[model samples]
Target: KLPPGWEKAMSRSSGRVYYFNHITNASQWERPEPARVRCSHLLVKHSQSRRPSSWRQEKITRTKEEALELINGYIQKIKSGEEDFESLASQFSDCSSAKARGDLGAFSRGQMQKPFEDASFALRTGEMSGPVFTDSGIHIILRTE
Candidate 1:
């Protein structure tokens, strides 16, 4: 929960409104992760229940190392013209906008938190970048063209 006097502080700072998203998690583990794999290794071997899905194993290395690789890897995808933004996002991203095909549309700044809003609006019509982080989790943004 927000601090008791926090709302008024934010309200008064019309020049720089900093707020947090009050996301609810059913389980503690369900909250924003630091960096992670698509699913647990156990989920893979439980093949009887497995279906056609796009589960990416992003943690082939340490998180810092993995972060570097994913960032570089995604940039190359853009350069290669193989950046399947929506397909990749649906398979990997934690954000709800992934359900909308990675197209965040035109949202007002300060509505979203820091690095996300920065990445979203920084690109030209079709540029992309990320494996960046906000307070929530890892983010890979492909600004819509």
Candidate 2:
């Protein structure tokens, strides 16, 4: 949550502040650099947040382990040139973009959730990342543009 090695401290007004210890090499969070960005994701969502009252009571489309298996297998196919990112996205993604072949088109920083934005910005063209967990669910992302 907090950057690696970051400590949580209380403040009277600000409430909490995060600071990095230079010695720890944990640094501040920064948005990805600007560029035309295209990406797609496959989501596995639960009926509620991750905090389920009972493990057995949890309702989700797929378990984390299951989603990982599917996404990782797709990754191998993409790496091996057996499948195209857009095609896989269209077939497997739960997002609205599935109708568009998982094409996110172009976007910039701040339009996405922090973690999602973080990963999307870090990738070079034609790169894939995730099963990134977010409030909505787990996502496997591929940067297209």
Candidate 3:
């Protein structure tokens, strides 16, 4: 039997068997790569972002440089274990995911912006990223699964 959270399906175009995982939102021809990843992120927005406003800041006026600096600081705290990623995220992340402790849940390729998606896929489980600049803002990503 397929593992929990997984379902077997046939491809519409190829008429071949595939696997899908509801937990990670991943689908593949093979048994779902242990490569399927789940992540959380702390986002800090700047004036240059596509939408500069966030739950934390009504009018994000900081420059990209400033946002980068702030996110980098957050990276340090997580790296040092001085603060919990979820705690800091809930209190300070500019993304609405902050309410859920920055949890972006699970996503597959092309589901997120390029930079964020690349950084997320590149990380090993339990790894965290440095400042990743995207159209949304600067982010510190944590790979949870």
Candidate 4:
């Protein structure tokens, strides 16, 4: 967090901020220089507004066949034993966790369903699973295993 009046230029998804603190002299190794200084302001807690991302959700009534196809497609991806959850999730998921490739961090008790929570706790790291379903659409859960 920064103090007030300091504006930090940020990037998308990358974990870093560029503020006047180190704005000047911002160069690759071996190119550091002086005099990059300019008007600097104290920092503040940078806040972002949720702009809704202009997203839309669809309530499709799959005629059994479409449902099966969608479910099975994910199932195959999981069983393929070589699925990339991050890529697939980023491409298809409608959730924020889709950003981390679906790493649902340590969901706590009463946080999820018995079955889902159980699986989350049980799933080994680095394993692709899923097409796991509940009331929500089929989800391909890649365990940390």
Candidate 5:
């Protein structure tokens, strides 16, 4: 017998068997896939950033150009092996996630800023992004899983 609250049903259009859960009002043709992803990122805040403050500075006075330059330099450091992403984030990122080595943890769609979320989902596991701009600041993302 099928498990409690679950029933095998036939699709009206495709004529395929699918699993349905009456209790939750959900259905699927196959096992549900994990809809969350994990990423870490470093943010550089400029004068125009939404908050314009960070752990590194109470009053971020740098222009967007300056912040971009600084973030680009950090990317080079990481790429050249002179610095690691985690340490760089901890030392320079503007987001509070910096305290956790830039880790944003597993999150689903609609949970983050659209630009940040789009850049993150576009990356493959173990891949890193160059520079992404959002209302909060500039960011470089690394997809862990």
Candidate 6:
């Protein structure tokens, strides 16, 4: 629930808006700067599901190893400041969140899949972690707080 008099607003990264109880007293209104993950994935598992029906295998765009290299390349570039996270996420990410600059917003423990939550929460703010593999594929997550 939100505090009385609070109004909802949209966050900059993700187009989807949320409510914030930041409209009451000055102290209560100031929301803490939240930590977030902006990631881009390279799909090595194009099957869409762990158990393929033999009809849904589709085309494997990348092998696991290949996906690692691809994601690593982006990591290197971002780590070295060759490219910013938003730009790369917008241009290369396969997920639909790419439209929102790959912003997953602020999530607490257990909110995400194990691999993703683990890697994301383990990183220091402003640091980009290497490929974190889940059932989906390889992901490079940046911890922005």
> Candidate 4 on 12-56: residue-level lDDT in tens?
567465542221111111111111111101111111211212122
Comparison by lDDT, 1 against 2, better one: 2
| Residues 59-137, model 3: lDDT tens digits | 9999999887888788778767899999999999998899999998988887899878877776658867767788998
Give the clash count for model 3.
0
Best by lDDT: 5
TM-score for predicted model 1 compared with the true structure: 0.47
Cα lDDT of all candidates, in order?
0.41, 0.61, 0.81, 0.40, 0.83, 0.58
Evaluate residue 126 in candidate 1 and report its C-alpha lDDT on the 0 to 100 scale: 48
TM-score of each: 0.47, 0.62, 0.75, 0.48, 0.76, 0.60
In candidate 3, position 80 carries an lDDT of 79
What's each prediction's clash count?
1, 0, 0, 11, 0, 0
Lowest lDDT 10-residue stretch of candidate 2: 23-32
Best by TM-score: 5
- For candidate 4, give the lDDT of residue 115: 44
Point out where model 3 deviates above 4 Å. 1-35
Give residue 19's lDDT in candidate 6 (0 to 100): 47
Q: lDDT (0-100) at residue 27 of candidate 4?
A: 14
Please report the TM-score between candidate 2 and the true structure: 0.62
Ranking by TM-score: 5, 3, 2, 6, 4, 1
10 residues in a row with least lDDT, candidate 4: 37-46
Q: Candidate 5's residue-wise lDDT over 10-115, tens digit each?
A: 9999999997754323355663324878999999999999999988899999999999899889988998899999999998999899999999999998999988
The residue-by-residue lDDT of candidate 6 on 1-145, one tens digit each, is 5445345676677756554422211111233223545433322343442532222234554566776777778877876788987887777766656767777767877677787776666554765555667777667776666
- Clashing residue pairs for model 3: none
Q: What does the lDDT come to for candidate 4?
A: 0.40
lDDT of 4 at 23: 18
